[model samples]
Target: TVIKNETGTISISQLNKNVWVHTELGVPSNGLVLNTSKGLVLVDSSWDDKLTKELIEMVEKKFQKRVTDVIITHAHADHIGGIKTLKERGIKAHSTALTAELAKKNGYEEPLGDLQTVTNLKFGNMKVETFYPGKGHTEDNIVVWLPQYNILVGGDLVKSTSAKDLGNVADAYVNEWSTSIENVLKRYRNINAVVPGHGEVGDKGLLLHTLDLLK
Candidate 1:
């Protein structure tokens, strides 16, 4: 069911019991909002501070819980642009060291830079994991895995079904993206739902489609 669906603003929809997906309209970005036993967890922030703050406000109001943590997928503005808001709000912004470094170089607030290649995180009731399959969308790009939900937040590494081609190649490791996708496929054999960096969500097929696009 739809939680908050608006025309130009951010739209939200339910994925699992307490897992939701929020899509910002500008770049049509997507992320996950998880209502855990402890507090709310975000998979990615919005495009910028203005929209990110609003995203937290809307979710907290609707879920009646403060956002506790946000695990970023990459250093791109479309993914980590709201790091400042997360920092000022005192919410934990988690990312790989490489992502943190790039964000610092890119003039964006840095994430925790604590996540290893494959790190498992446990919240109140949600168990989330981060995996660095390899360089795909960017050298620091990573994927978030929800064990309980069997969901893979593929970030820009996995393109959406509507994606005619890879969107942005500015920081992309084009030659290595396919290998990264293979790693993800080998790791997660069962994926209930998959959220891309943009456009609509799909299943494991998105990963295969991305490989095809790379070819």
Candidate 2:
């Protein structure tokens, strides 16, 4: 389903019985909601506090569940800006150790208790594995893989087909970006769908296109 406004567009689609992807306009980040036996698991909150709340509310209303966990894909504002709000709501917020440290440096003080060097987390019946493929968009970026659904939440490391060039490179590892994406390609196989941090969702070609962009 698609929802539009003057600012930008939002697309909400169910990837499977347990996974749903929410892509927004104006910002490239994609927010994912997974329905597990425990509760709703959110991946990468939106760009701002208000939008994050609205996104969660929308998911709760649509899925008839509450958000219990928020897994941040990176430390960037677009990905972790809503951490403050989620923390206040008593939701379990998690990220890699590097991501947590970087987020703190960025002045967003929210406790990410499950700070793992490589996170292999299980909530109810759902399994989420977050690992550092390498440095591409940022040193702290990680990819979220759901082996059960064969879906990869490729944060900024993977770009959409609509992206003409690498979006932001201020902190990007230009020379290493392509290699980092290549790592993801070789590491995660049988990815039925790839939900980029922005743009339209596609298959593995999205990873290829991001590699091409870096090249």
Candidate 3:
């Protein structure tokens, strides 16, 4: 069902003229879909099969196009779970070499698990080049950058809400994470918007927020 942040379960919020945010159930996770010139390009697949299926329907209905690419932000289960389903539909999955390798090491299998190292996605007049923004939440984490639009799709490196402080953690690269955020900020000069793997979408200020928390 299409929910609108009622129970704070999963809701859809429009971030801009062409971008939409899909907030997940009870967690900070969010998936993004952009209306591009060619068709549609998804940011990160949210957790579980059910949520992913809902997302698939939402994108197809709203954009009137099958998801051309499912960009796996990282190897984390919460972000990459839906990739399996996307593969079922024969959609091409793209990610950094590190993410794919981590996913494989974690025993998360994909039929189209060839692991895409480079992705030159096109949507009409827009183009996005995916690359590693350095390690943050995980060593395999990667960020998607739309140079033409000055939009950055930050996996778990950044978020719109207050940073959650988990008492326990694994693979939290605080130092590398800070460096990654700085790298992103420096690489793109005209970042008008930032979309995180979790929480809502925000502006460049979110970059500072993330950096502060990491520091």
Candidate 4:
């Protein structure tokens, strides 16, 4: 169900039943909005203020629902750049405790930059749980799990790319990446699909494929 962007204003593609991956810079990377019964929940903002706002408008019109929550996968610039606008506009931001602390420790708060934290998160009927799932892409990397939908939104922790030319290996915990994937597999056995931070979305086998490459 790839949602075509006729306006040429944004590149929006539906990767699976519950997720839509947006192409902001000609690459099918950056940002994700999870459609729920109440509203949309975003995973990471692709860039800074402008693109984030544009994407918000585009998404709102397409989904006909306001983005109620924005989930930051990690503290990377490309991932967290647009957090400011979301914060200023009063969009609830959710992330692992480590992500928030790491952002502040790395000079992103106060006189340096803006940082927002999660206030409320819905679960159960409107199921949504944030888990760090151990370390993979980074120590603070967190994956969003939808038990009812069996969907795993893994950030750079588990990429759609192979291991040969893996990007940003320095921040990655290779061994832990394998462990985290295994955890996801065991914890969410019913996962029919995966929404990775980069590259095309696929089924749960992506966990096994990534493990093979890392092995």
lDDT agreement with native, every candidate = 0.91, 0.81, 0.71, 0.68
Model 2 spans > 4 angstroms off: 2-11, 26-28, 111-117
Taking the tens digit of each residue's C-alpha lDDT, what string does model 2 give over 30-90? 8688899888998888787777777877777777888999888788888887788888888
Local error of candidate 1 at residue 45 (angstroms): 0.6
Tell me the tens digit of each residue's lDDT in model 3 across 1-215.
34463354556677666777777773567767777767777777778767777777777887797777777878888877777787787767777767777778877754233345445667676677776778777877777777766778876777665655421148768878888888888877678778876666777887788887765
TM-score-based ranking: 1, 2, 3, 4
lDDT of 2 at 203: 82
**Judged by TM-score relative to the true structure, which candidate is superior, 2 or 3?**
2
Q: lDDT of candidate 3?
A: 0.71
| Candidate 2 minimal-lDDT segment of 10 residues | 2-11
Over the stretch 1-215, how does candidate 1's per-residue lDDT look in tens digits?
Answer: 77664445877898878889989976689999999989999999899998898899999998899999999999988788889999999999999999999999998878999999999999898999999999998999999999998999999899999998998888888899999999999999999999998979999999999999998
**Clashing pairs for predicted structure model 1, backbone only:** none
Model with the higher TM-score, candidate 1 or 3: 1
What's the CA RMSD of model 4 in angstroms?
Answer: 4.1
- Model 4 weakest lDDT span, ten residues long: 110-119
Give me the displacement of residue 129 in model 2, in angstroms: 1.1
Q: Candidate 4 residues 153-196, lDDT tens each?
A: 77676667443445777778888888977877776778766777
- Best candidate, lDDT: 1
RMSD of each: 1.1, 2.1, 3.1, 4.1
Model 4 lDDT on a 0 to 1 scale: 0.68
TM-score versus the correct structure, for each prediction: 0.97, 0.92, 0.85, 0.82
User: The CA-based lDDT of model 2 is what?
Assistant: 0.81
